[PDB]
Amino acid sequence: MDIXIDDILXELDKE
Amino acid sequence: MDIXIDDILXELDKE
Amino acid sequence: FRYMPFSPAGTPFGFTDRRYLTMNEVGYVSTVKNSEQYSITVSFFDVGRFREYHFEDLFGYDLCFLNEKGTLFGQSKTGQIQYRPHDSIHSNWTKIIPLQAGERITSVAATPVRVIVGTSLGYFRSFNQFGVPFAVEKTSPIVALTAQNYRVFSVHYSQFHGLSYSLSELGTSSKRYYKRECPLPMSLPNDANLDYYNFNPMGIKSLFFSSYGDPCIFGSDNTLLLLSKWRSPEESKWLPILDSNMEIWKMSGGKETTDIHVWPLALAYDTLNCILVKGKHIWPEFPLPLPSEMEIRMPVFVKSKLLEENEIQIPVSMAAEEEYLRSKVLSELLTDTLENDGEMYGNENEVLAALNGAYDKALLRLFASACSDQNVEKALSLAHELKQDRALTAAVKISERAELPSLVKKINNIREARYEQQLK
Amino acid sequence: FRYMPFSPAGTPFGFTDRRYLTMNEVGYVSTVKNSEQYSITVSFFDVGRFREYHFEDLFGYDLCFLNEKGTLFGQSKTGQIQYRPHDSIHSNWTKIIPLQAGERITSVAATPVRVIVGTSLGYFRSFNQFGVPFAVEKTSPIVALTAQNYRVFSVHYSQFHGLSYSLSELGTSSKRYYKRECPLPMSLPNDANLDYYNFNPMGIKSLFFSSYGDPCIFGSDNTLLLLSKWRSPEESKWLPILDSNMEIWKMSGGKETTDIHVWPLALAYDTLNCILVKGKHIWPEFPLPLPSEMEI
Amino acid sequence: FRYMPFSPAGTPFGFTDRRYLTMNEVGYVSTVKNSEQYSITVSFFDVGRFREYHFEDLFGYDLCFLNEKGTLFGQSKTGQIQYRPHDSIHSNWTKIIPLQAGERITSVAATPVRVIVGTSLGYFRSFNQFGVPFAVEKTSPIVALTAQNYRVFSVHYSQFHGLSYSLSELGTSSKRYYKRECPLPMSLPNINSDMKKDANLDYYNFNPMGIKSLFFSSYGDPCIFGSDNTLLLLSKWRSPEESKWLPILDSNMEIWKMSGGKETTDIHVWPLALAYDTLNCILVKGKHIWPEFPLPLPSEMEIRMPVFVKSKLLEENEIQIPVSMAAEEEYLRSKVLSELLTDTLENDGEMYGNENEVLAALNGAYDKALLRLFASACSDQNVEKALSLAHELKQDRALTAAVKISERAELPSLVKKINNIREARYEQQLK
């Protein structure tokens, strides 16, 4: 089961 | 141009 | 054993009358046989900063070292050296090094503040940039030298230990050793390139300090070795950070080639500046190609697994593991630099910040794969290695999206535990 | 010199189709040649504590290391390793180690927190118990490895000085060397046992940490060597604390025998755990005798 | 490799029946094959201070060490040692050193307060001046020992590490290491297949490592003199990370300069001691490189930094040295000796009572030689090289002399920069 994480990773990019 | 320094060195020995 | 004159990235004559004396990120120095003497050419990669020039060599310089301020030349048998600043403001100077019977100069190096000469008998002679001698030291026989500012990285050879290395600083006071004749785990040469190994028996294609000050060496196995933790004598270790044979393999679409070779010039943070040699011989020829860039990669990729996933395409899960390990190594090295020496190049603080960001991001990808595989234990160990507290938060959200509530509680215990250290 | 795959107390096939991969105080691991594959059996001396199991080996594992929490397997030529926890709560995992041309895995070791792989080119690769890689290090060519908690005892070989050893700690911070490629005063090997010396040219029958944390080695002279005071670089020395040839001689009522041999399993606080081998060969065969104890 | 019994400046029998057991600035000890036994003679260079004596050796002593208070003898195979004080106050004493099978005594040493014995297995046995044993230590195999007061300089050899050295102090109740088995960068002999009929092959069978002698200098710094005939001095040995071996005398080059720039093969140097800046030695004239009987009077050879080149010296012509080229060597020699003596005085203080005056004169010669190099840089219009030379000056009055040399050279920009050095040294003195 592939997990959607790309949105969570972009949330981590925000400063 | 050779520079004369022997008099300056002799003055350095005196205290 | 016969000691041959060493210079970083130098090439042999072969069947021609010309070769490269030395070569790095600043430029390249070549010599050509004419009549009875030699014609030396000093060329630069930044053409706008310095002007290429040539001069007649009446002595037969076979040793050379190049930096951003000048070029150092040496004659291995006669002991004569010459330092030529790039700018004509400063004058050239010449010196003859005393040599005993059978003693040869094996390596020279220069920084804007220091000039170093090593011999086959282990004589270590240092000078300032103007030729003023500072100290004559007796060590093990020297085979290769490099330098950066006041620091010297020397490679030694005896019949007892094999290859060893020393790491020292020539401050305004006395010479201090960070590492004194420690083991050098560089593989020694073990057919068409026989002319090179007669020219360079140790197979050291080049060695240099990185742009951030870490010693590097590049041997016959074409693997870039970087010395980590060299400020702590008990923690220093050599790290293989680039298997250039593997990178050429991946560049060729996964095909075994014997016509492409890597010639190392320098390590700029995460990129190996090199010459890509295309031809029968492993050393570059004339004219010299434009320098290339090869990003460093931890040697964790396996050819068989890479073939199944098909220039070679890397699966995102396997690429995350390498990026995590590479970010971990580079982050630890750069942190040690900033905590002891401060900034040297000018962008280390921003590089370290981006480095830690890429570290956690690659770690979170491995964390998601562990969650997808229902491996809660492997996921928790991955979460323990995260750096940013905001990355622990991202891991909680990935655990919730994976419907692993037991993992969420254990990761939240990590966040609470770190917040407790924040209260002390 | 050719690097052979090493495992603590491992035995050669000889003229049979079975042998022991590794062996210590926890138990013993055997492999059997069958039709087209191999059958590996993991047995334990404390039958009440662990569950014996066997499985079909499609890869031909020739390296093994056994501890109280799991078993580590390695394939010297392909670079494949597998870690199998004893408890079924934790899952097995498999990994392929990158190997250059002619490079072999020479020794593997594992603790509850670390997995170690050494190669004939001197590559030192470490992982945690779940397979997450931590660091790739370049050292002298590795011939033997053992580990305990966060500590690693490695035996190295160079073409100049011969055998050396390193002693390090793989802490949470960084790896620290207590001893870095120091002289290894183990006697090299000087025939019915010719198969063993082709199987293990260095003659290191086994190596391990003692129960109190000191490195031990057991060579062809059958003498147990203990590294004492290794935390003080200026006071560390190797102590011969048991000449098993002398104890076997005293056990036989003062008669010189050539049919009893000692196969070392572990060093506890005051007793050398071992297998007493009775036969032509110096290595144990099937079935395995009950473990013995020899007072220091 | 075979461990041979070593003694400082000892010579082999060769094709004769006599040889020197040991030799230094105090005197020399010789042994002569007498029928079935041996006749040992202890001779002194200060004839008015000590009386030469002789005794019959029924044991075959092949090891010896000589100091100002007594003579130590050793038997490499039996393990017997004897200490014989020069003065009759204390009596001689004899001891048998325990030796395992195949274990030999390789070197002995003695001071007025310490007696040291080293073995081929690396056993390090020490005693006080009366024979009271100290702790027994196990080290690497020992090949050479020397000692001065309470400090010991030991050379070790294994097939694993090659040559190493240790530097230690034998305190009242324990041995303390300043340096423990660090690399010893002394060149080993290079013997060919034609040496099997060479006249000096006998020495290298007698002394395989080629250590002609080793000793502490008069100021306490360890020195060694190998087959390359270069005096090596250990600098900064109180700082483990800064310790370095310094070649301070190429005696082959000095013999060449003494011979008027001619390559000779009949003159050799046999090292006895280092007195501050002078190597006490025997000038051996003959086919063999070691002295024979009778012993010549001791000579003195001043140390010289190995910076002179034969080709350059021939163009400037006993060899005469140009004052400009002599200044570079004198500056380097003064720099090395000043740094060593400063470390000695700041840690051990004075031992002879006049070291501060010696150090003061040393720093004077340092600045004086530096000012000559500064004048050559000014004469060559090399303002940058001259400023770097001025930074190395010690005395503030020497900075003034450099200003006056710069004014006489009409380099006003250099004058301002040297006066900036004076200002900077005034600011640092206030912090």
Cα separation, E56 vs E31, whole angstroms: 9
List the one residue out of D155, D86, D159, D74 whose CA is nearest residue D115.
Answer: D74
Q: Give one DSSP letter per residue of chain D, joined into a string.
A: --PPP--TT----TTSSEEEEEE-SSEEEEEEE-SSSEEEEEEES-TTTS--EEEEESS---EEEE-SSEEEEE-TTT-EEEEEESSTTSPPEEEE----TT--EEEEEE-SS-EEEEETT-EEEEE-TTS-EEEEEE-SPEEEEEEETTEEEEEEEETTTEEEEEEEEE-SS-EEEEEEEEE--PPPP--TTHHHHHH-TT---EEEE-TTS-EEEE-TT-EEEEEESTTSTTT-EEEEEEEHHHHHHHHTTS---SSEEEEEEEE-SSEEEEEEEESSSSS--SSPPPPEEEE-
Contacts by residues D190-198 (CB-CB < 8 Å, ≥ 24 positions apart): D190/D220, D192/D280, D192/D281, D193/D281, D193/D282, D193/D283, D195/D12, D195/D13, D195/D14, D195/D15, D196/D11, D196/D12, D196/D281, D196/D282, D196/D283, D198/D4, D198/D12
Q: Is the preceding omega at residue E294 within 30 degrees of 0, hence cis?
A: yes
Q: What technique solved it? A: X-ray
Q: Hey, are the CB atoms on D132 and C385 less than 8 Å from each other?
A: yes
Whether the ω angle into residue D287 lies within 30 degrees of 0, i.e. cis, is yes
Chain centroid to Cα D4, Å, comes to: 13
- Reported structure resolution in angstroms: 2.4
Whether E18 and E33 have beta carbons less than 8 Å apart is answered as yes
Rounded Cα distance between E333 and E321, Å, is: 16
3-state secondary structure of B9: helix
Helices E412-428 and E396-408 meet at what angle, rounded to 10?
A: 170
> Residue D109 is encoded by which pair of tokens?
């070791």
Which chain E residue's Cα is nearest to B14? E397
- Chain C nearest C-alpha distance from D38 (Å): 23
What distances in angstroms separate CA E182 from CA E153, E156, E237, E239, E243, one per listed residue?
A: 12, 10, 11, 13, 10
Cα E266 to Cα E259: distance, rounded to the nearest angstrom: 11
Strand D206-209 with D215-218, pairing? antiparallel
Residue of D8, D42, D12 whose CA lies nearest to D204: D8
> How many degrees, rounded to 5, is the angle at CA E321 between CA E317 and CA E326?
155
Cα C68 to Cα C56: distance, rounded to the nearest angstrom: 22
What is the distance between the alpha carbons of residues D41 and D74, in angstroms, rounded to a whole number?
15
What six digits make up the tokens of C242? Answer: 């680039």
A1 touches chain C (CB under 8 A): yes
How many Å separate Cα C9 from the centre of its chain? 12
Torsion angle of the four alpha carbons C388, C393, C394, C398, in this order, in degrees rounded to the nearest 10: 140
CA distance linking residue C186 with residue D140, whole number of Å: 8
Chain breaks in chain B (C to N over 2.5 A) after: none
Residue with tokens 């702590």: C232
Which residues on chain E place their C-beta less than 8 Å from a C-beta of chain B?
A: 364, 367-368, 371-372, 375, 378-379, 395, 397-398, 401, 404-405, 408-409
Cα–Cα distance between C310 and C318 in angstroms, integer?
14
Across the strands, what pairs with C81? C74, C95
Task: Say whether C327 sits in a helix, a strand or coil.
Answer: helix
Q: Quote the minimal CA–CA distance from C90 to chain E in Å.
A: 8
Helix (H, G, I), strand (E, B) or coil at E36: coil
E338: its two tokens: 């000043």
Residue in C278, C267, C256 with CA at minimum distance from that of residue C214 = C267
At how many degrees (to 10) do helices E412-428 and E383-391 cross? 20
Angstrom CA distances, C380 to C295, C358, C363, C411, C422, stand at 31, 19, 11, 7, 22
Q: Is E123 helix (H, G, I), strand (E, B) or coil?
A: strand
**What is the CB neighbour count within 10 angstroms for residue D162?**
16
Nearest to E123 by CA among E111, E141, E135, E108: E141
In one letter, which amino acid is D8?
Answer: P
Q: Which of C333, C402, C324, C332 is nearest to C364 (CA)?
A: C324
Q: Are strands D292-295 and D271-278 parallel, antiparallel or unpaired?
A: antiparallel
A15 part of contact set with chain C, CB < 8 Å? no
Please give the single-letter amino acid code of residue E220: G
Is-contact E31 E43, C-beta < 8 A?
no
Question: b or e along C63-101 (b: 16 or more beta carbons within 10 Å of the residue's beta carbon)?
Answer: bbbbbebbbbbbbbebbbbbbbbbeeebeebebbbbbbe
Is the bond preceding E85 in cis, omega lying within 30 degrees of 0? Answer: no
Phi/psi at D27 (nearest 5 deg)?
A: 175, -155
Angle (CA) C82-C86-C90 rounded to 5° is 75
For residue C96, give how far its alpha carbon lies from the nearest alpha carbon of chain E (Å).
Answer: 7
Surface-to-core class of residue D18, CB atoms within 10 Å of its CB (0-12 exposed, 13-18 middle, 19+ buried): middle
> What is the DSSP code (8-state) at residue C258?
S
**Cα–Cα distance measured from residue E427 to residue E431, given in angstroms and rounded to the nearest whole number:** 7
Distance from CA of D124 to the nearest CA of C (A): 10
Q: Is E216 helix (H, G, I), strand (E, B) or coil?
A: strand
User: What is the rounded distance in angstroms from the CA atom of residue C65 to the CA atom of residue C73?
Assistant: 7
Residue written as token pair 């910076």 = E307
Closest Cβ opposite residue E375 in set B5, B11, B13: B5
Instruction: Compute the C-alpha angle E319/E321/E325, nearest 5°.
Output: 150
Q: What residues in C contact E236, CB-CB < 8 Å?
A: 174
Question: Which residues are bridge partners to D243 per DSSP?
Answer: D223
> Which of helix, strand or coil describes residue E127?
strand
